[PDB]
Design a protein around this ligand. Sequence first.
Ligand SMILES: CCCCCCCCCCCCCC(=O)CSCCNC(=O)CCNC(=O)[C@H](O)C(C)(C)COP(=O)(O)OP(=O)(O)OC[C@H]1O[C@@H](n2cnc3c(N)ncnc32)[C@H](O)[C@@H]1OP(=O)(O)O
Ligand SMILES: Cc1nn(C)c(C)c1Cc1nnc(-c2sc3ccccc3c2OC2CCNCC2)o1
Ligand SMILES: [Cl-]
Ligand SMILES: [Cl-]
Ligand SMILES: [Mg+2]
Length: 384
Amino acid sequence: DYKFWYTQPVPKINDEFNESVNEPFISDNKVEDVRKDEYKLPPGYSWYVCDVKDEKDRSEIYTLLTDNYVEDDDNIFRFNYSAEFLLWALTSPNYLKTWHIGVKYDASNKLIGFISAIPTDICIHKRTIKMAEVNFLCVHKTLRSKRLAPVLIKEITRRINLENIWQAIYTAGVYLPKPVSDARYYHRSINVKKLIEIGFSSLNSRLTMSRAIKLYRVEDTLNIKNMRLMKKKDVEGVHKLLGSYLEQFNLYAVFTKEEIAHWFLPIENVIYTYVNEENGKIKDMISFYSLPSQILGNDKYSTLNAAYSFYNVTTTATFKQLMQDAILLAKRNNFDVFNALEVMQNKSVFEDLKFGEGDGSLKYYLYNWKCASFAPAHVGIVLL
Ligand SMILES: CCCCCCCCCCCCCC(=O)CSCCNC(=O)CCNC(=O)[C@H](O)C(C)(C)COP(=O)(O)OP(=O)(O)OC[C@H]1O[C@@H](n2cnc3c(N)ncnc32)[C@H](O)[C@@H]1OP(=O)(O)O
Ligand SMILES: Cc1nn(C)c(C)c1Cc1nnc(-c2sc3ccccc3c2OC2CCNCC2)o1
Ligand SMILES: [Cl-]
Ligand SMILES: [Cl-]
Ligand SMILES: [Mg+2]
């Protein structure tokens, strides 16, 4: 019935728009009309302004997400973003502290809910719009289905609107009104035996353990011999190679140089970017971020280390060669599995590179924006 979502400026479940329609649901908004009062929480709970740059506040958010964030369909794996990853995700250029919103239960002083946004320029069907990117919405498991999430969403919308920003982008595995695109995820096994033992992957009578390990074996040599970790000096060249590439898609972020530096310079166990430089020119890039899963109820293993394909561009090799090197560089950095979405050119390499189709998909949404939906090959943004 979507009783909350139907009160919001998003498409109805049946809405379908021509390619010519590309505009807000509600235009001519006025900063001066936005509510100044915080939305009301139930008795005994209060808003909390989180300082993600303080280790202790950042620790509280980490604990909340570690225990209560997203689980796979079978409740065996739960995302386990690290504290340094949350730091990086939330302190991008021109971030606002007041868009990092916690909810505490007054009597324990414990964080029980969270929601965040960062500002990003988003190009949708060739119109660039100042938006908020929303992520890390989470309500403690003990307080589910109490209608707290619409409170968090309405409060962040109010604070975003105070900055004269009236559109947002977000992704969810759940179906809401109404996806602008829908991308399945695929997984390429790296540590086969481990993935079998935790029930991420399976065997069978044809594929014995030894034959499954042989199947996923990779040669420890790069297609692009000079691919190396990105350094500060490469920010200009990355901004030109990526910025040009992305303009073909129907939905992408428009990065400034300061955004390239933030989103790509390598941070161990967070973000890995590699470049191929020729003549002082960046001609190819690979990137992926680290998003481990906590494994629930396995006696031997508690963590699955997973590399998540972010942005990959090649001008000197085939896309298949580039993605093969991405898998190898993930392997060299101790990752058990390489995960990709069917966005950009990704799907075209999944069969040859031995990726397996996963169990669900990620829906891309816009808030207060009406437009034609599109196949995921035309999606040119990867969220965290
Ligand atoms: C202009 C600026 C605009 C800014 C804002 C833009 C929009 C931002 C929107 C947020 C984008 C976040 C993106 C993001 O973070 C990445 S998707 C990750 C979401 N987090 C998790 O799945 C963590 C585990 N789950 C939870 O913590 C709770 O289940 C949550 C908190 C998800 C819902 O808590 P609950 O205790 O289970 O539920 P109630 O409080 O009773 O609330 C039920 C209402 O919530 C609607 N709902 C449920 N899940 C949602 C989801 N993932 N997006 C949006 N809405 C969601 C649901 O359809 C229902 O509305 P309806 O009756 O109409 O159906
Ligand atoms: C696998 C998996 N493990 N777990 C713990 C979950 C809930 C899933 C399902 C899932 N839900 N979102 C995604 C994926 S796969 C992928 C590959 C490359 C880039 C992004 C993603 C992605 O979503 C990202 C970005 C949106 N938030 C979650 C991670 O995967
Ligand atoms: Cl209201
Ligand atoms: Cl482990
Ligand atoms: Mg609730």
